[PDB]
C-alpha cells in the first residue's frame, strides 16, 4: 500500500500491469488442454476463484493511482473482467460449454453430483461485462437455450412415441419443477420470465 | 354540472311519479359514467318514507353506488337515521330499512359505519319483547360476519357475551340464526375467544343438555375445525356417555363424528368412535324414524373411509367390510349410502402382513352372492348401483370374477331385455359387459355367446345414440373375444356371421345418424372384416365403396383409416386389389392439410396396404404418393416423416422398378432431414433399413458408389448430429455389400493423407469405419492398426470421442482378435489411457453376453488394477466400467464385489462404492432384488471412516434415492440418524484466512452439507410421509448461517414446505422467522465490490419471496417483528409480486 | 469494540468504531498495522477532531471552532493535508481546502510565493494583456 502512492514516472504502470495480467492469464490457460470432462470443470472453477480473489485483493490494495487524476477500462476490477472476457473467446469456450452440457444431461438422467463446478462459471458469465450481460446472452446463454430446446424436443418426441400422455404430464411437470429449482438456486434470477415464456 | 343538477332537482321535486323515475334513471346513469350532496341526501331520506314502491326501489338502488362519491361526514348521520327508523312500527318501513342497510353494506368495501352498527346491535341483540327484531338483527350480524370480520380489536368480546343468552331462545328459528352467526364469527375469526367459547360450552354440557349445544358445536367445528385438538379428549367421552339414552337424540352426536374426521385427520382416537358407529348401525325397531338414524352413521363411514389411507389392514382384518356387506337389505337411502361407501373404498384400494389382494380375493365370493341376492329387485337405482359395483370390482384388478360368469350372465340379460329400464341403466350395463369381456380371458365367454348375441344385436338398433354407441362397442369386443387369433380356439361361429353383419351394415349408412355412432359402426365393421371377413365373400367386393366414399368426409376420416389399417394388417388375407386402384389416390389427396393424427393414420394405412398387397400397382398412384411426400416431410414433425419413409423402404424391397423417379425434390428433402438435429432412435434405424434396401435393389443411378460420392460431396465443400447421421447412413449403405474392397482402401488412404484433408473428413471416415466394423470382419487386411493410430494421434479434442468410439466398435466387431491387443495396450501405454479406457467402456457396453462371458475374469483382473489413479476422471471411468460389468451375471460378480468392503483399503472401498452407484437405473433391472439386500451392508459398513469416503457414500445415497426412492424405503429409518449426524457445524479443516480487511473462509465440508441437503430435498419430493417431521424441521431451521448457496436451498425448501402440507410449519413460526429477520436487516459491508451487492438483492429478494410464501398460509394473525416498512425494503414487496 | 493501531514512532492509541466510522481507509481495517506516514501528533489531532465531530446530518460558511483549531504553523498544515490526502477523508479535507482558499483570497503575488516556498519577465506582460477583462 505504501508503494502504491510511493510510485509517483507515476503514469507508466497501467501498461505493465495489463501485460503482466495478460501473460499470466495465457500461461494459466495453456495448462487447460489435457482436461475435457469431469476434470476440466473443477480445475477451471478453482483457477477462476483464485483469479477473482487475486483481482479483489489487487483492487482493494491499490485503487488510488488508476483513474483519479482525469480518467480497457482503467478500473482494476473492470480491467480484469475485460481481460477474462476477451481471453474467453479461445476455443476452450466450446469445450467448457460441451462439458457443462454433458454434465447437465447426466444430472437429468437420474443421478446427482456437486453443483459448484458449473455454478462457478455461471457466476463468472453473470458477473462478466463491467449486471451488464453482453457476451453472456449473445453467445453462451443463446447456445445453451438452443441445446436445451433441442433436448426437450427430443424428450417430448421419444416420450410421446413410447410412453402414454398420462406419464408425459407427470414427466413434464417434474422437468418444469426442476427448471424452476435451477433458475432459483442454480442460475441467475434475471431470466425467470424469458425461460418460463 | 351545477345548473344541470339544479334543474334536475327542481323538475324532479314536483310531486310526480314519472318525473322522479326519469330523474333517478338520470342520476344513476351519471353516477355510473358541498351543498349538492346535502340536498341529494336529504331528498333521498325524504323519498325513503314515500309510500310508492318503484320510487323506494329506485332510491335504495341508488343508495348503493352513492357511497363512493358522497362525503364521509354525513354517512354516520344517515346510518344513525336508518337505525332509528329500524325501530319503527310499520313493517314496510322495517323492510325498506333492512334492504337499505343490506345494500350499503354490500356495496361497502368511512369505516366508522361498521363500528357504529355493531355497537348499536350489541345492545339491540339483548332481550326484547319483539322476536322479529331479534331475527332481523341476527340476519344483519350474519351478513356482517360473512362480509366484514377485519380488525375488530375490541368488539368481539362484547358481541360474544351479548349473544350468549340468546342461544336459549325458545324459538328454533332464533336458535338457528344464532348458531349461523356464531359459525360465521368463528370462520371470520381472537387469540383466546374460542377458548372461552369452548370452556362455556363444556361447562354447559354438564347440565340439562339440549340439541342446541351439540348443533352449535358441530357448526363452529365445520366452520373452523383446525383449532380444536386439545378439547376433543373430553368431547368424545361426553358424546359416548350421552349416546346411551332412550330418547331419539343421537342424530347430532353421530353428525359430529364425520365432520370431526374431515377437519382433523391426525388423531389417535379412531377405534373407539369406529366401534361406537359400528354398534350404532344396528338400531332397528313419518312416525317411524329408525330408517333415518343410520344415515348419519353411513356418512360417518364415508368420511372415515375417505380420510384414512395408511391403515388398510386395520379396516380389512376387522368385521367392518363384513358388516358393511351384510347390511344391504335396508331402505333405499341406506342401500345407496352403503353402496357409495363400498365404491369409495374400492376406489381407494388402488395403490398411491398379507397384501390386500388376499383378503379381497377371499371376500370376492361374498360380494358376488350379496350382489346376486340384491339383483332380485325392480328398482332401477339398485340395478345401477349393482352395475357400478360390478364395473368397479372388475376394473380394480384383472381376472377377478373368473368363477361367477355363469351366475352373473342371467342378471345382465334380464337387465338388458326388460321393458322397464332407463337409458342410464342400459348404458352402464353395456359398459360393465364390455369391460368384463375385455379384462377377462376369452375362455370364460365361449358358452355364453348364444345368450349374449341376441340381446346385444337387439340393443344395437335404438333411437338413442349413447346406447347405440355402447352396443357397438360391446359388439366389437364380443367379435374380438369370440375369435382370438392369439391362441387357437375350437368353436363354430357361422350362425352369428350374418346376425352381426346385418346390424353392422345397417348402422353404417348415414340415416341422419350422429357422428359418434357412425364412427363406432365403422370401427365395428373394420374389426369384423379384419378378424372374420373370409366368411363374408358375397358382400366383400361391393361394400368397400362405403369406406371410399366416407374418406372424403371430414367428420369420419380417422376412424375409417384406422379400420382400413386394421383390415390390411390381418393375418387372414383380405381382397382389396380392385379397391386399391381407386383408394390410394383418395388417401394421397389428403396429404396437404395440417393434421398430425390424420397424416400418421393415412401413412400407416398406405404402408400396411403396400406391404400386404403389392401384386398390382400402377405408376399413377406411385407418382401421386411421391409428389405428396415433400409436403409431409418437415423438420418440426418427426413421426410423419418416419412413417412416410416406410413407403420407400417397402417399395425398394417389394417393387424395385419404381425408384428411378425418386430424385430432385424427395431426395433433397430426405438428405436435409438426415442431417437434421432431431433424428434419433427408430428414425435412424429406418434410415439404415431404407438405405440398405436402396443398395440391394440393384437399379441404375442408385448404386453404392454414386450415393457415397453424392453424400461426401457436401462434406468436402454443421453440428455433430449431422456427422453422426451421415456416418450411420454411409455405414448402412456399405453394410449390404460386405465384399467392398475399393471403398475401404479409399477411406484408408483418405485418412492417411495429410494434404487436402480436414479434421471433419477424417473424423467422419473414422466414425464410419468404426460403425461398419460392428459385425463385418475387416482384420484380414494388413497395415490397419498403424494408420488408425496415426489418424487418432491428432491435437483436436473433438476427434478424441469419435476415435474412441471407432476403436471400441472395431474391437467389439470380433472380440478374440482385438481384446488381447487392447489389454496389452492398457497395460503398456501410460500416456494414452483416457482413449483406451473410453474404448473399453464402449466395448463393455456393446459386448454381447455370449462373447463376454469367457472374458469376464481377465477384464475383472485388469479393472481392479486401475482403481488407484491420480486423475479423477480415470478412476470414475473404471468405476463406471465396473458398474456396467456388474450388470451381467450378478450371482458371481456381486458376491466378490461385496468382499472388499472390509478387506480393501479406503481407496478400494471408495472405488467399489463409486462402481456400484452406477448399477442402479431408472428402468427395472434383474439385479434389483440382490441390490435391495446388498445396500444394507454397503451402507452399514460405511459409517464414518474418512471425509472423502463419507462424501462418496452420501453421493451414492442421493443417487440411489433419486433413481429409485422405493428401493431404499425400508433402510431409510436406519440411516436417518447417520444422515442427520453430519448436518451440524463441525470444525474439521476450516483454515482461517487472516489477510486483512477481506476474508474468504475455505470450508471443505460445504460439499458434504450440500450433498446432505440434496438428499433431504429429494426425499421430501419423493416420499415425505416416511420420516420424523419435527427433527427435519429443526435441522432445516438450524442450518442457515453457513453459506450462500445453502441459504438459498433452505429458503427454497421452506417455500416448498409452505405449499406442501403446511400443518407442521405453522407451529414454529417465530423460530423460522427470526433468522430471516436477523439476516435481512443485514447490510453488507459497504466498499465491497459490486457483485456482493447484486447477490444481496438476491438474498434480500429471496428472503422477501420466502416470507410471502410463508405468509400465504391461512394463519396470519401473528405479526412478530414484521411491521417495519423501511426505505431500503420499501420496494421489495412489489418486486416480489 | 476497542481497536488498537501502531504508530510510526512506536506508540499505541485506542480507537472506537463510532469514532472511525467517518473514515474509509481505516473503516476497512476495523471491519495494529504499520503506518509510517502518520505520526503521534496527527493521530491525537485527528482522533480528537473525530470525537468532537462524529454526529451530523448526512463565518465563511464553516464552523467557528475550525478557525482556532487550524491556527498552526505551515509545517503542521503540510503534514495534515498530506495525511488527509492519504486517508482520503472528506470532512477534514474539505475544511482545510476551504481554509486554504480563504487565506489565498486577495493577496499579493510576492507574499503568496514566499509563503508557499516554491515564468516572470518573459510572459508576465502577455498574461496581463489578456486578463484585464476581469
Swiss-Prot record, chain A:
Tissue: Expressed in lung fibroblasts.
Superkingdom assignment: Eukaryota
UniProt PTM comment: Neddylated; which enhances the ubiquitination activity of SCF. Neddylation prevents binding of the inhibitor CAND1. Neddylation leads to structural rearrangment in the complex that allows interaction between the E2 ubiquitin-conjugating enzyme and the acceptor ubiquitin. Deneddylated via its interaction with the COP9 signalosome (CSN) complex.
Disulphide connectivity of cysteines: none
Parts of the chain that traverse the membrane: none
Domain notes: The Cullin neddylation domain restrains the RING domain of RBX1 in the E3 ubiquitin-protein ligase complex; this restraint is removed upon neddylation of the cullin.
Assigned protein family: Belongs to the cullin family.
Complex and partners: Component of multiple Cul1-RING E3 ubiquitin-protein ligase complexes commonly known as SCF (SKP1-CUL1-F-box) complexes, consisting of CUL1, SKP1, RBX1 and a variable F-box domain-containing protein as substrate-specific subunit. Component of the SCF(FBXW11) complex containing FBXW11. Component of the SCF(SKP2) complex containing SKP2, in which it interacts directly with SKP1, SKP2 and RBX1. Component of the SCF(FBXW2) complex containing FBXW2. Component of the SCF(FBXO32) complex containing FBXO32. Component of the probable SCF(FBXO7) complex containing FBXO7.
Entry protein name: Cullin-1
Organism name: Homo sapiens (Human)
Primary gene name: CUL1
Positions spanned in the full protein: 46 to 289 of 776
Curated annotation (Swiss-Prot), chain B:
N6-acetyllysine found at: 46, 898
Repeat region (HEAT), residues: 1-33, 35-72, 74-109, 114-148, 154-189, 190-226, 227-261, 314-351, 356-399, 403-442, 447-484, 495-534, 538-575, 578-615, 620-657, 661-700, 702-735, 736-772, 779-816, 817-854, 855-887, 888-925, 929-966, 970-1024, 1026-1060, 1067-1116
Keyword annotations of the record: Acetylation, Cytoplasm, Nucleus, Phosphoprotein, Repeat, Ubl conjugation pathway
Gene Ontology MF term list: TBP-class protein binding
GO biological process: cell differentiation; negative regulation of catalytic activity; positive regulation of RNA polymerase II transcription preinitiation complex assembly; protein ubiquitination; SCF complex assembly
Coiled coil: none
Function: Key assembly factor of SCF (SKP1-CUL1-F-box protein) E3 ubiquitin ligase complexes that promotes the exchange of the substrate-recognition F-box subunit in SCF complexes, thereby playing a key role in the cellular repertoire of SCF complexes. Acts as a F-box protein exchange factor. The exchange activity of CAND1 is coupled with cycles of neddylation conjugation: in the deneddylated state, cullin-binding CAND1 binds CUL1-RBX1, increasing dissociation of the SCF complex and promoting exchange of the F-box protein. Probably plays a similar role in other cullin-RING E3 ubiquitin ligase complexes.
Entries under PANTHER family matching the protein: TIP120
Assembly description: Interacts with TBP. Part of a complex that contains CUL1 and RBX1. Interacts with unneddylated cullins: interacts with CUL1, CUL2, CUL3, CUL4A, CUL4B and CUL5. Does not bind neddylated CUL1. Interaction with cullins is abolished in presence of COMMD1, which antagonizes with CAND1 for interacting with cullins. Interacts with ERCC6. Interacts with DCUN1D1, DCUN1D2, DCUN1D3, DCUN1D4 and DCUN1D5; these interactions are bridged by cullins and strongly inhibits the neddylation of cullins.
Curated annotation (Swiss-Prot), chain C:
CDD domains named in the record: BTB_POZ_SKP1
Gene Ontology terms, MF aspect: beta-catenin binding; cullin family protein binding; F-box domain binding; molecular function activator activity; protein domain specific binding; ubiquitin ligase complex scaffold activity; ubiquitin-like ligase-substrate adaptor activity
Superkingdom of origin: Eukaryota
Family from the record: Belongs to the SKP1 family.
Alphabetical UniProt keywords: Host-virus interaction, Isopeptide bond, Phosphoprotein, Ubl conjugation, Ubl conjugation pathway
Protein name: S-phase kinase-associated protein 1
Pfam families: Skp1, Skp1_POZ
Cross-referenced PANTHER family: SKP1
Signal sequence range: none
Organism annotation: Homo sapiens
